[PDB]
Design an enzyme around this catalytic site. Sequence first.
Site, PDB file in Angstrom:
ATOM      1  N   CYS A 141     -30.560  19.874  34.963  1.00 37.64           N
ATOM      2  CA  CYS A 141     -30.559  21.268  35.478  1.00 37.64           C
ATOM      3  C   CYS A 141     -31.104  21.303  36.889  1.00 37.64           C
ATOM      4  O   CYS A 141     -31.966  20.480  37.225  1.00 37.64           O
ATOM      5  CB  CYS A 141     -31.380  22.226  34.626  1.00 37.64           C
ATOM      6  N   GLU A 175     -24.853  17.513  35.279  1.00 36.98           N
ATOM      7  CA  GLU A 175     -24.442  17.914  33.919  1.00 36.98           C
ATOM      8  C   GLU A 175     -23.787  19.296  33.977  1.00 36.98           C
ATOM      9  O   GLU A 175     -24.285  20.236  34.669  1.00 36.98           O
ATOM     10  CB  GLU A 175     -25.644  17.856  32.990  1.00 36.98           C
TER      11      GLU A 175
END
Length: 273
Positions: A141, A175
Amino acid sequence: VKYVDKIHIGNYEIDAWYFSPFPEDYGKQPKLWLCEYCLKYMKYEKSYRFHLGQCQWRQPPGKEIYRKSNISVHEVDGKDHKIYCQNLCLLAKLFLDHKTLYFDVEPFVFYILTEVDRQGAHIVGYFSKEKESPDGNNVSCIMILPPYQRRGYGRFLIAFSYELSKLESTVGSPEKPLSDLGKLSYRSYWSSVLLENLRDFRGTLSIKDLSQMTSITQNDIISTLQSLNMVKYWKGQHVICVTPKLVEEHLKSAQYKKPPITVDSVCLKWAPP
Ligand SMILES: COc1ccc(Br)cc1-n1cc(NS(=O)(=O)c2ccccc2OC)nn1
Ligand SMILES: [Cl-]
Ligand SMILES: [Cl-]
Ligand SMILES: [Cl-]
Ligand SMILES: [Cl-]
Ligand SMILES: [Cl-]
Ligand SMILES: [Cl-]
Ligand SMILES: [Cl-]
Ligand SMILES: [Zn+2]
């Protein structure tokens, strides 16, 4: 069940964008109050003011692995600084739709970006990275706090994530799914890196060459070149197709800005695992 809708951190009051699973009692007050240095969350203005007089921290924990002028990055292992990292993940989830881990932080390393003044090192944003990524993600993140958004700090942190990947001699990709801002931030970074490389380099670079040079994945290079009209398809293969003319046009246009902050390899103190 009232959700946290507003935080106080340092001199800022910031509205929430998303649910974050702070304990139920923390959502019940008008604001949640966060120590800008240790990220302790508090229910009351009075407990916050008490804490600010007692708390000795003036920067993130962990090791300062990057310092150039008043821009700093700290590397924080989730196993060594668990409460700090959980606090950071709950803060992050107020501004990230797709972050799903907040408590089980031991598998991650956190890279905290701060802007320094005589008072202390003030948190701007961070990215998390799995110690062991089954998918070769170089970012799990990534978040910039609203008051610092669209000001070059996101590009800096993305650049920083690829500087680590380059030292690890690996490619990586963030991601998915990405945030709306994250998608814009990443395309802008990838566009900037690929054009700068094609300009500066004498002779022709392939997609495989650009991947080895930048640690950007061939897939992310291909999607970026498609967005710049700089790739053809030939017998089942993507082939770079550009003139120094078209590269120059892109670099000289309003669609490209010189990075406000760049990652100086000389200011990075980091050995790969
Ligand atoms: C990885 O970026 C994010 C991921 C999550 C969340 Br929430 C926010 C961001 N982010 C990034 C930016 N800043 S920037 O320097 O990249 C940038 C500069 C100029 C114009 C647009 C920009 O970004 C669109 N601010 N927010
Ligand atoms: Cl706000
Ligand atoms: Cl609130
Ligand atoms: Cl300190
Ligand atoms: Cl997550
Ligand atoms: Cl969790
Ligand atoms: Cl967003
Ligand atoms: Cl690849
Ligand atoms: Zn504190």
